[PDB]
Amino acid sequence: MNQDFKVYLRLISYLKPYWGVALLVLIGFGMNSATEVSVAKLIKFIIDAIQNASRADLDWFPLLIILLVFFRGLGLFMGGYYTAVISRSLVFSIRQEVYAKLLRLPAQYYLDNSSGHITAKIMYNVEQLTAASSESLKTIVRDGMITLGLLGYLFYTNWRLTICIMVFLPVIGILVRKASKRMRKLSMQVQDTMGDVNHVVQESINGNAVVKSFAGEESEQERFYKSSEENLKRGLKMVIVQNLNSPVVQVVMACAMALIVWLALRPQILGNTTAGEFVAYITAAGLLSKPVKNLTDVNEKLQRGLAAAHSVFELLDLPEEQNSGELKPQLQGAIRFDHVVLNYADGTQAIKDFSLDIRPGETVALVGRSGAGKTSLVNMLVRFQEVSSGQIYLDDLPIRDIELSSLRTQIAMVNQQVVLFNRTVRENIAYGQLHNASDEDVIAAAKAAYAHDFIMNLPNGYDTVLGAQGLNLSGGQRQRIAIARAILKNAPILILDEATSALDNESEHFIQQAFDEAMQDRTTIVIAHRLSTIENADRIVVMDRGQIVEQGTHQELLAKHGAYYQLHQ
């Protein structure tokens, strides 16, 4: 339960480059505090000048008005503006850090956690951090200082009476604590339910074709309501708790007021400046009412931001993709699987004691049933999945010794399920590490794949902004953009995971003919089911439930009368 202090301290580490502007908020809120205590002083002055008859003093009051207010504004702005600067800026730094963390999270994270839930963390939670911090830091400092000024003033004015207020403080302290802990639990619940609403909406957007074909609209609406309504009945409860706590505190303050007043309304009243001194105390006691109601109202906002900071720090403390390395060039591309075993988070054993040695500039074809672990094997080469027992040596170097970005930039991949961005055709080909390729480099790539001619037929050529998943292009078309992207990469190691599955006989013929000219001392791993493209591979690896069955050339395996010979049914 003490974990709040740990989160508070962590947050403070971020406001180290803001110490300069931090005192600029204290100066500003210190003078606004000075302006509120000066109100009580002015009411005593205006009475004393009317009582002890001093019109000469009263002539100054109009000049004092346009001065107290001017000096308030100048301090109120200095305090308010810099608070926002510190807050909004500090949160911008967190938004960056949280995003950077995300890009460092492994492939399993992305698989286990939906877009909606992930989004709510960087969006809703970091946005809640902004609002809560920019309003709580403002109120807590501005109205906190005001309270401290007026408490000080009441002590200088009459410490005998002000000291009776301190006995009523453990009541308020217990009342604010009970409400605070209740609203924190609710803050946790209001943010989770919000990530749930985000999840429901994001999924509906992704699966719009299934939602439409299978008429799932009523069912999506139902689950949207379910999560939407929980989120509503939770924020309502939080508001009831808030809107009920602040006045109960005001009433337990009024009881301290009346008791202090009944003692101040004891026989000997002719001591203080009749009205002047008496009214000044009552005015400074009332000038305290509003800044305190503000301090109790900010508690909802404060519990909300604490729940969000806890979520942000949790995200930033998640285990991420392990990266410690060296910048090797992969040269030609020798690959060695030494007693490799691949276990998925869920305990599935996709690869079992797989051992294979690929020589540089060799075309090795992975063939087998679905569930053989072909994609699983190839995914290990780019560290999408970490080796759990065994080793992968790329040029006799343990794969994990190579710096992650140095490995990836050297291994070209044509994934089984083609992934495209909502960017131009050119931006999709010259993506990431290829974002410095010239227009001529892009056209060269699209020509190497059978992509150039269809690109030229699109409404805007290479500048046709592709839709959501490039779903404004046909099946085989999206597939050739992915090939163009990998060809442009021109990497020592190439990976073709069902790269032709959506291509017509004339596209498949040109691309395979253009992949004969792409054995430029380039090691390539082909996962194909069309026994025609497999046929010309240097080595054929028959896989079954993460193990090798057979190995060898198209002739060798057909002569063996086994699995490969039987696959020629």
Ligand X SMILES: CCCCc1ccc(S(=O)(=O)Nc2ccc(NC(=O)CCC(=O)Nc3ccc(NS(=O)(=O)c4ccc(CCCC)cc4)c(C(=O)O)c3)cc2C(=O)O)cc1
Ligand Y SMILES: Nc1ncnc2c1ncn2[C@@H]1O[C@H](COP(=O)(O)OP(=O)(O)NP(=O)(O)O)[C@@H](O)[C@H]1O
Ligand Z SMILES: CCCCCC/C=C\CCCCCCCCCC(=O)OC[C@H](O)CO
Footprint on residues 331-350 left by a copy of itself (CB under 8 A): 344, 346-348
Q: Which of 83, 128, 296, 375 binds ligand Y (CB under 6 A)?
A: 375
- Phi and psi at 267, nearest 5°, equal -20, -65
Q: Which of 107, 259, 261, 356 binds ligand Z (CB under 6 A)?
A: 107
525 binds ligand Y (CB under 6 A): no
Residue 551: beta bridge partners? 541
Footprint on residues 343-402 left by Mg ion (CB under 5 A): 375
Footprint on residues 238-257 left by a copy of itself (CB under 8 A): 239-240, 243-244, 246-248, 250-251, 253-255, 257
Is 524 annotated as belonging to a binding site?
A: no
370 binds ligand Y (CB under 6 A): yes
Q: Which of 144, 216, 476, 552 binds ligand Y (CB under 6 A)?
A: 476
The CA-based dihedral angle spanning residues 532, 535, 538, 543, taken in that order and rounded to the nearest 10 degrees: 90
Can you tell me the distance from the alpha carbon of 353 to that of 131, in angstroms, rounded to the nearest whole number?
Answer: 54
DSSP 410: T
Q: Which of 45, 278, 337, 384 binds ligand Z (CB under 6 A)?
A: 384
Q: Give the interface segment with a copy of itself, choosing from 173-181, 222-230, 510-518, 546-554 (CB under 8 A).
A: 222-230
Closest residue to Mg ion, judged by C-beta, is 375
What is the DSSP pairing of strand 349-358 with strand 493-497?
unpaired
> Which has the closest alpha carbon to 391: 365, 367, 357, 359?
357
Min dist CB 12 to a copy of itself, Å, is 21
Q: Which contiguous run of DSSP H or E holds residue 23?
A: helix 19-51
Q: Which of 1, 2, 13, 55 binds a copy of itself (CB under 8 A)?
A: 55
Q: Give the interface segment with a copy of itself, choosing from 9-17, 144-152, 466-474, 554-562 (CB under 8 A).
A: 466-474
Q: Which of 39, 275, 519, 549 binds ligand X (CB under 6 A)?
A: 39
Q: Which contiguous run of DSSP H or E holds residue 544?
A: strand 539-544
| CA 177 to each of CA 123, 167, 182, 189, 239: distance values in angstroms, whole numbers, following the listed order | 29, 17, 9, 19, 16
Cβ proximity to ligand X, 37 vs 455, nearer residue: 37
> Which has the closest alpha carbon to 542: 524, 560, 569?
560
The CA-based dihedral angle spanning residues 344, 350, 355, 357, taken in that order and rounded to the nearest 10 degrees: -90
What is the DSSP pairing of strand 523-527 with strand 363-368?
parallel
Can you tell me the distance from the alpha carbon of 83 to that of 90, in angstroms, rounded to the nearest whole number?
Answer: 11
Q: Which contiguous run of DSSP H or E holds residue 176?
A: helix 169-206
Cβ proximity to ligand X, 20 vs 62, nearer residue: 62
Min dist CB 417 to ligand Z, Å, is 4
Can you tell me the distance from the alpha carbon of 326 to that of 323, in angstroms, rounded to the nearest whole number?
Answer: 10
Cβ proximity to ligand X, 286 vs 371, nearer residue: 286
In the list ligand X, ligand Z, a copy of itself, none, the entry touching 74 (Cβ below 5 to 8 angstroms by class) is a copy of itself
Q: Which of 371, 463, 559, 562 binds ligand Y (CB under 6 A)?
A: 371
Residues 6+ apart with CB under 8 A from 101: 315, 316, 318, 320
* Terminal Cα distance for the chain, rounded: 67
Q: Which of 324, 417, 457, 555 binds ligand Z (CB under 6 A)?
A: 417
In the list ligand X, ligand Y, a copy of itself, none, the entry touching 331 (Cβ below 5 to 8 angstroms by class) is none
**Beta carbons within 10 angstroms of residue 470's beta carbon:** 21
Cβ proximity to Mg ion, 475 vs 562, nearer residue: 475
Min dist CB 377 to Mg ion, Å, is 10
3-state secondary structure 308-366: HHHHHHHHHCCCCCCCCCCCCCCCCCCEEEEEEEEECCCCCEEEEEEEEEECCCCEEEE
Min dist CB 384 to ligand Z, Å, is 4
27 binds a copy of itself (CB under 8 A): no
Q: Which of 128, 283, 303, 379 binds ligand Z (CB under 6 A)?
A: 379
Min dist CB 419 to ligand Z, Å, is 5
416 binds Mg ion (CB under 5 A): yes
Footprint on residues 277-296 left by ligand X (CB under 6 A): 282-283, 285-289
| CA 290 to each of CA 87, 96, 155, 283: distance values in angstroms, whole numbers, following the listed order | 24, 37, 19, 12
Alpha helices in 52-125 (DSSP H): 55-58, 61-103, 107-112, 115-120
Q: How many residues bind a copy of itself (CB under 8 A)?
A: 164
- Phi and psi at 424, nearest 5°, equal -65, 165
Q: Which contiguous run of DSSP H or E holds residue 494?
A: strand 493-497
Min dist CB 475 to Mg ion, Å, is 4
Min dist CB 251 to ligand Z, Å, is 55
Cβ proximity to ligand Y, 406 vs 469, nearer residue: 469
Footprint on residues 238-257 left by ligand X (CB under 6 A): 253-254, 256-257
Can you tell me the distance from the alpha carbon of 487 to that of 417, in angstroms, rounded to the nearest whole number?
Answer: 17
Residue 542: beta bridge partners? 367, 550
**Beta carbons within 10 angstroms of residue 84's beta carbon:** 16
Q: Which of 17, 475, 521, 530 binds Mg ion (CB under 5 A)?
A: 475
Footprint on residues 142-201 left by a copy of itself (CB under 8 A): 197-199, 201
Is 147 annotated as belonging to a binding site?
A: no
Can you tell me the distance from the alpha carbon of 54 to that of 50, in angstroms, rounded to the nearest whole number?
Answer: 6
In the list ligand Z, a copy of itself, Mg ion, none, the entry touching 99 (Cβ below 5 to 8 angstroms by class) is a copy of itself
472 binds ligand Y (CB under 6 A): yes
391 binds ligand X (CB under 6 A): no
- Contact set with ligand Y (CB under 6 A): 111, 344, 346, 348, 350, 370-376, 416, 472-477, 502, 504
- Contact set with ligand Z (CB under 6 A): 107, 110-111, 206, 208-209, 375, 379, 384, 415, 417, 419, 468-469, 471
Show binding-site residues for Mg(2+).
375, 497
- Contact set with ligand X (CB under 6 A): 39, 42-43, 65, 68-69, 165, 253-254, 256-257, 282-283, 285-289
